[PDB]
Ligand binder design. Structure first.
Ligand SMILES: [Zn+2]
Lengths: 98, 144, 346, 243, 49, 48, 96
DNA sequence: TATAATGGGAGCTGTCACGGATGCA
DNA sequence: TGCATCCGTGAGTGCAG
C-alpha cells in the first residue's frame, strides 16, 4: 500500500503529488504467457499458500534521474465519446510531470 | 581444445546441404492468426529450433529430461531455444546460380579463370547470348 | 542492361498470329490431346505419363525432370524405353504419336505467340506488392492454363478467352505472396472490402469514418469490434532497418530490447533460487524431500495426480500424499527461520 | 507431314548451346587445373610482357584453387544457404506490431521465383518464359547476397530504400566488423558533464554517488549483505529501485 | 511541389479506370481515389528533411 | 466535370480530396499534434 | 542512449587506447563480459553478487553472428586448433 | 471460365581522388 | 606500347536521435 498511496482507484497518480525514481505513475496489468509458472515457481508458491497469479505488474514507473510534481493527466479510452485510437488499443493515459 | 587459427574457404553445395536442417519450401513467415511459425517456411521450428527452451512445438515434450527427441506430432527437437541462432537452412535451386562476388568483383574470378571477358560473363549469365559446349558440327556463315 | 526492355525484345521476335494460324495451332493442340488418350487406351499406359513423353521429345532432351504426380522418375532411359513401345504401333495406331507430337509443338508456338498480350495486362496491376516481371511471369503462368482449356470451336478469338486466366493468375499472386505475413486469399479479399467502402464513406463525409460508420455500411454481421480486429491483422510489418534520423547512423531496430533471452539479473536470480530450495530439502529430511522433489521437478517437472504416485515411491498411494503435506508442512515451519524465500515471490 | 505424306527435314544441328550459370557451372566443372597451369607457365615464357603479365594474374587464380582444394564450380550455387531465423528476426514491438529484417523479404522474393520455376518447368513452358524465370532467379540471388551491386537495387514498395543485403550487413562503417567486432557498446559504464575539481589529487576524480551506485550495483548488492543492510541480494536490489 | 506529385499519381489512376470498367456509367466521384494525394502531402510533412 | 470524348456526357460532382494542413499565425504547423517548421531551401535557380 | 538505459559505445578509437596501454585483460573484458559474452556476462553478475572473482570469458556471441552470416554467403569459416582440426564454437548446437 | 483486347515507365542531376582494368591511334 | 577513360571504393569520434 505504500507503493500505491498516491494512485487513484483507477491507477492514475493523483494530480499534485511528488513522484521520484521507482514510483508508479500508472498501474497496468498484462497476462502471463506460456511461461505460466514452471515447476521451480509453482512449487515455491505451493509453500506460501498463495497460488500462481495470472496477471503481471507492467505499470509505468519513472525512469532513473527524473521526477517531479504530477501536474495533469489525460485519459483517452475508447467506448468514451470523441475518441478512437489506433487498432487494438483500448485506452491510453498521459501524465505530465513538472 | 584451443582455437588458434581461423580458416575461410568456399562452400561446396554438398557442404551447404551439410549445414542444413531444412529446405525452406514455402515463403511463409508466421501464421496471421496463431502468430506462430508456419511449417516449411522461414521460421518453421522443425527445421531451425524449439522457440521455447526444451519445449516441442505442439505441446508433446516439455522439459529437460527429454533432450534431443524429435517429437512425432509436430517434429521439433527438445533443446535450448538458442539454436534458432545457429541452425542453417537451405534453398534447393532448380537451375544453379552464380555467387555475384565471384562474378562482379573485378577482375572477375570466374571470368579470368575461363578467359571470359567481363561483358561475356554477363551476357551468358543474364541471358543475352548463348555459349556452345559441343557444336555437334554446326557451322555458321561458312565457318564451323 | 534493363531486364524489362530485354524481355520486351525477345517477345517482339515471335510474330503475332493471324486468324488462320490462331485456329490452326489451337486445332492441332485439341486434336493432340484426344490423340493422347486414344494413344493411352490402345497401349494402356497413362494419359499424363504419355503426355510428358511427347513433351520431352519435342522440346529436346534439353529438359526432363521427374514430374510430380507421375509415378516413375522420367529420366532419359524411360523416355527412350517408352518412346519405343510407342513407335512400335501399327501405322493406323502409331498414327497418333505423330498427332501428339504435332500438338505439343503447336502448344508452344501458341503460348510464345501471345506473350505480348500478358504484358499489356500485368502492366496495369503494378504497384501492388509485386514487380512488373513477377507479374508478367504470373500472367504467363495463367496463359499456359488458357491453351490447355481453349475450345477453338466456340469461334472466339484467343485474346478473349485468355484475358480471363491471365488476370485470374496475377490476382492470385498479388494476393498470395505480397504480404510478409501470408493471409488466406479470401481474408485478403474482404480486407480490400473495408478499404474500398471506407474510401467512399470518406468521399461522402468529408472526413475519415469511425469504426462504427464502417460496420454499418459494411452491413450485417459487421460491428465496430469486428472491423477493428480485422484491421489489426490487416497490419503489414515494418523494417528493422528503417532509418532513424536524417543521417544514417541509427536503425529502428537498434532501439528494440531482446525480451527473450534471460537478463543477467534473471539468469542469476534463477540459479540462486533452484539451490536455496535445494537448501531447504536437505535440511529436515532428504527422502521426504525426494518424494515431493518428485511430486514436481528439479528439472523437467514430475506431476500428474494419483497414478505414478501409486507406482514407485516405496509407499502406498495416499500415504505419499500425506508426507506430501508434512514435507510441505515441515518446509512452512522450516521456512520461518531460513526466511530467505519470501523475496523470490517479487 | 501427314497431309503431304512427305517426311520433312529442316537443316539444323543438335548443338549444345546454353545460357546462364548452368553453362558456367559446366565449363568450370570441366577445368583440369593442372593442365591450365602447364599452359600458362608454358606461356609465362613469352615476350611482350603483357601476355606474360595476364598469364600471371590467371595463374595466380589457378594456383589459388590448386593449393586450397577449392573447386571452381563452387563459385556457383545449387543450394543457397539460409541464415538462422534469430539473426533476422520477426518481433512484436510494444503495440503488438511486428518488426522484421530485410532478409526475409529478400528470401521470400527468391523462394517465390525458385518455386514458380519448379512449376514453370514441369508444366512445360516455352524457353522465352523459362528464360525470364531463370534470369529473374539470378537477380533474386544477386540481391539476397549483394543487393545494389548489379543493376537496380531491390526496394520494398512505397519507398526508395535499398534493402539490406548480406554484404551490406557485413561491410561499411555500420557493417558487422566495424560496428560490433572492433568495438561494441558496454556494461558498467556511464556518461556525464565534467567540471574541474582543483582540490583533487593527481590520481583522482569526482564521481557522483548516484552514478557510483549503478556502476557498482553488483558490488553494492553483495556488501549490502556482508553487513546486513538487507537479508539477501535480491531484497537489497529492491531497496535501490525506488529512490 | 509535393502537391503536383499527388495530383500526378491521382491522374495515373483515373485514366486507368477510364479505359477499364465501364465507359459510360461513370462519375467524377468514383473515377477519383484521393489517397495518392493524401499520402504525398502526409509524406512531405511527416518525413521530409 | 466529366465529359465524354464522343457523346457529350456531362457529370459534375465535388469530390473530397482529404485534408491539407494549415499554418498557424506564428507561421508553424501541427502534425500529429506536434508543432513543426518548414525550413526554406536554397538551391541553384532555373535558367541557362 | 539514456532512454533505453544504454551502455556506452567503446569504439575502435577507444579499443586502440586500451591497446596502446597494453591493457589486454581490461580490453578483453570490454569485448566479452561487459557486452555480449552471454555466458561469462551472466557468469560475472553472479560472481559479483556472490563475492567471487569474475570468470575468464568464452567467445563473444557477436563473432558467431559473423560466422553464420558468412555461411549465409556460402563461405565456410572454421575455428581451428593448432594441429589444424576444427573447434566447435557452437558446442555441438549446429552439428548433427 | 468465352465480344475483343498482343513491346514499360521514370530517369535526377552542384564531390573527389586513387587505383585498377579496358579501349584505342 | 603508351595513355585516355570508366567503374568501384573510400571519405573522424562519441552523445542527443
Ligand atoms: Zn510435439
Amino acid at each position: 500500500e505504500a507503493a500505491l498511496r498516491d494512485l487513484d482507484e483507477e491507477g492514475v497518480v493523483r494530480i499534485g503529488a511528488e513522484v521520484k525514481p521507482g514510483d508508479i505513475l500508472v498501474g497496468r496489468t498484462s497476462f502471463k504467457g506460456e511461461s505460466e509458472p514452471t515447476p521451480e515457481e509453482r512449487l515455491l508458491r505451493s509453500i506460501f499458500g498463495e497460488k500462481a497469479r495470472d496477471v503481471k505488474d507492467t505499470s509505468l514507473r519513472v525512469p532513473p534521474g527524473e521526477g517531479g510534481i504530477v501536474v495533469r493527466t489525460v485519459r483517452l479510452r475508447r467506448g468514451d465519446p470523441g475518441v478512437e485510437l489506433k487498432p487494438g488499443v483500448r485506452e491510453v493515459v498521459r501524465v505530465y510531470v513538472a | 581444445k584451443e582455437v588458434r587459427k581461423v580458416r575461410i574457404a568456399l562452400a561446396s553445395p554438398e557442404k551447404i546441404r551439410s549445414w542444413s536442417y531444412g529446405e525452406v519450401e514455402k515463403p511463409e513467415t508466421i501464421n496471421y492468426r496463431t502468430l506462430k511459425p508456419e511449417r516449411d517456411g522461414l521460421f518453421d521450428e522443425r527445421i531451425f529450433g524449439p522457440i521455447k527452451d526444451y519445449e516441442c512445438a505442439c505441446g508433446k515434450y516439455k522439459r529437460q529430461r527429454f533432450e534431443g527427441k524429435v517429437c512425432e506430432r509436430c517434429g521439433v527437437e527438445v533443446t535450448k531455444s538458442i539454436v534458432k541462432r545457429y541452425r542453417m537452412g537451405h534453398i534447393e535451386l532448380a537451375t544453379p546460380a552464380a555467387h555475384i562476388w565471384f562474378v562482379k568483383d573485378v577482375p572477375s574470378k570466374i571470368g579470368t579463370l575461363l578467359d571470359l571477358s567481363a561483358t561475356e560473363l554477363e551476357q551468358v549469365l543474364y541471358f543475352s547470348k548463348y555459349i556452345v559446349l559441343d557444336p555437334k558440327g554446326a557451322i555458321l556463315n561458312g565457318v564451323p | 542492361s534493363d531486364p524489362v526492355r530485354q524481355y520486351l525484345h525477345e517477345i517482339g521476335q515471335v510474330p503475332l498470329l493471324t486468324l488462320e494460324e490462331e485456329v490452326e495451332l489451337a486445332r492441332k493442340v485439341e486434336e493432340g490431346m484426344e490423340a493422347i488418350k486414344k494413344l493411352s487406351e490402345i497401349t494402356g499406359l497413362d494419359p499424363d505419363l504419355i503426355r510428358e513423353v511427347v513433351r520431352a521429345k519435342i522440346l529436346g532432351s534439353a529438359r526432363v525432370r521427374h514430374i510430380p504426380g507421375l509415378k516413375e522418375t522420367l529420366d532419359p532411359k524411360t523416355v527412350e524405353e517408352i518412346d519405343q513401345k510407342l513407335k512400335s504401333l501399327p501405322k493406323e495406331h502409331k498414327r497418333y504419336l505423330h498427332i501428339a507430337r504435332e500438338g505439343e509443338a503447336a502448344r508452344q508456338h501458341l503460348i510464345e505467340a501471345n506473350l505480348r498480350l500478358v504484358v499489356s495486362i500485368a502492366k496495369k496491376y503494378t504497384g501492388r506488392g509485386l514487380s512488373f516481371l513477377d507479374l508478367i511471369q504470373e500472367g504467363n503462368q495463367g496463359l499456359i492454363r488458357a491453351v490447355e482449356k481453349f475450345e477453338y470451336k466456340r469461334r472466339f478469338k484467343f485474346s478473349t478467352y485468355a484475358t480471363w486466366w491471365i488476370r485470374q493468375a496475377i490476382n492470385r499472386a498479388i494476393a498470395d505472396q505480397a504480404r510478409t505475413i501470408r493471409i488466406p486469399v479470401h481474408m485478403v479479399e474482404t480486407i480490400n472490402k473495408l478499404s474500398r467502402t471506407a474510401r467512399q464513406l470518406q468521399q461522402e463525409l468529408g472526413r475519415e469514418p469511425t469504426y462504427e460508420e464502417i460496420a454499418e455500411a459494411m452491413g450485417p454481421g459487421w460491428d465496430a469490434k469486428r472491423v477493428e480486429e480485422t484491421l489489426k491483422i490487416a497490419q503489414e510489418p515494418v523494417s528493422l532497418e528503417t532509418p532513424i534520423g536524417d543521417e544514417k547512423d541509427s536503425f529502428y531496430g537498434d532501439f528494440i530490447p531482446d525480451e527473450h533471452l534471460p537478463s543477467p539479473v534473471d539468469a542469476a536470480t534463477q540459479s540462486l533460487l533452484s539451490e536455496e530450495l535445494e537448501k531447504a530439502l536437505s535440511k529436515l529430511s532428504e527422502r521426504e524431500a525426494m518424494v515431493l522433489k518428485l511430486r514436481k521437478g528439479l528439472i523437467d517437472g514430475r506431476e500428474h495426480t494419483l497414478e505414478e504416485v501409486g507406482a514407485f515411491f516405496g509407499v502406498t498411494r495416499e500415504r505419499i500424499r500425506q508426507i506430501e503435506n508434512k514435507a510441505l508442512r515441515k518446509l512452512k515451519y522450516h521456512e520461518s527461520r531460513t526466511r530467505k524465500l519470501r523475496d523470490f515471490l517479487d | 507431314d501427314l497431309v503431304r505424306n512427305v517426311v520433312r527435314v529442316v537443316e539444323s544441328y543438335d548443338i549444345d548451346a546454353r545460357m546462364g550459370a548452368e553453362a558456367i557451372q559446366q565449363l568450370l566443372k570441366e577445368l583440369d587445373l593442372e593442365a591450365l597451369e602447364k599452359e600458362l607457365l608454358e606461356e609465362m615464357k613469352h615476350p611482350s610482357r603483357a601476355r606474360r603479365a595476364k598469364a600471371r594474374k590467371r595463374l595466380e587464380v589457378v594456383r589459388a584453387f590448386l593449393d586450397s582444394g577449392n573447386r571452381p564450380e563452387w563459385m556457383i550455387l545449387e543450394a543457397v544457404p539460409v541464415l538462422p531465423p534469430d539473426l533476422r528476426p520477426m518481433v512484436q514491438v510494444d503495440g503488438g506490431r511486428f518488426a522484421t529484417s530485410d532478409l526475409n523479404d529478400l528470401y521470400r522474393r527468391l523462394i517465390n521465383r525458385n518455386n514458380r520455376l519448379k512449376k514453370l518447368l514441369a508444366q512445360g513452358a516455352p524457353e522465352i518464359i523459362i528464360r525470364n524465370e531463370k534470369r529473374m532467379l539470378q537477380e533474386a540471388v544477386d540481391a539476397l547476397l549483394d543487393n545494389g551491386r548489379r543493376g537496380a537495387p531491390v526496394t520494398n514498395p512505397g519507398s526508395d530504400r535499398p534493402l539490406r543485403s548480406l554484404t551490406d550487413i557485413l561491410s561499411g562503417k555500420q557493417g558487422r566488423f566495424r560496428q560490433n567486432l572492433l568495438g561494441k557498446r558496454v556494461d558498467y559504464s556511464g556518461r556525464s558533464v565534467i567540471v574541474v575539481g582543483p582540490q583533487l589529487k593527481l590520481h583522482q576524480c569526482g564521481l557522483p554517488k548516484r552514478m557510483a551506485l549503478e556502476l557498482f550495483k553488483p558490488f553494492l548488492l553483495k556488501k549490502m549483505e556482508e553487513k546486513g543492510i538487507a537479508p539477501n541480494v535480491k531484497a537489497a536490489r529492491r531497496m535501490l529501485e525506488r529512490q | 511541389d509535393q502537391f503536383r506529385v499527388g495530383l500526378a499519381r491521382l491522374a495515373r489512376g483515373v485514366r486507368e479506370r477510364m479505359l477499364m470498367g465501364s465507359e459510360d456509367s461513370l462519375t467524377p466521384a468514383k473515377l477519383v481515389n484521393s489517397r495518392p494525394l493524401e499520402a504525398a502531402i502526409r509524406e512531405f510533412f511527416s518525413r521530409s528533411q | 466535370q466529366l465529359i465524354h470524348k464522343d457523346t457529350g456526357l456531362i457529370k459534375e460532382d465535388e469530390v473530397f480530396l482529404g485534408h491539407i494542413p494549415l499554418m498557424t499565425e506564428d507561421g508553424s504547423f501541427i502534425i500529429n499534434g506536434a508543432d513543426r517548421v518548414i525550413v526554406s531551401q536554397i538551391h541553384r535557380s532555373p535558367g541557362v | 542512449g539514456k532512454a533505453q538505459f544504454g551502455g556506452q559505445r567503446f569504439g575502435e578509437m577507444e579499443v586502440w587506447a586500451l591497446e596502446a596501454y597494453g591493457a589486454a585483460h581490461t580490453l578483453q573484458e570490454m569485448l566479452t563480459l561487459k557486452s555480449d559474452d552471454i555466458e561469462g556476462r551472466n557468469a560475472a553478475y553472479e560472481a559479483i553478487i556472490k563475492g567471487e572473482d569474475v570468470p575468464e570469458p568464452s567467445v563473444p556471441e557477436s563473432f558467431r553472428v559473423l560466422v553464420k552470416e558468412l555461411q549465409a554467403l556460402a563461405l565456410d569459416v572454421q575455428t581451428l586448433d593448432e594441429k589444424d582440426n576444427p573447434v566447435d564454437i557452437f558446442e555441438g548446437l549446429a552439428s548433427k
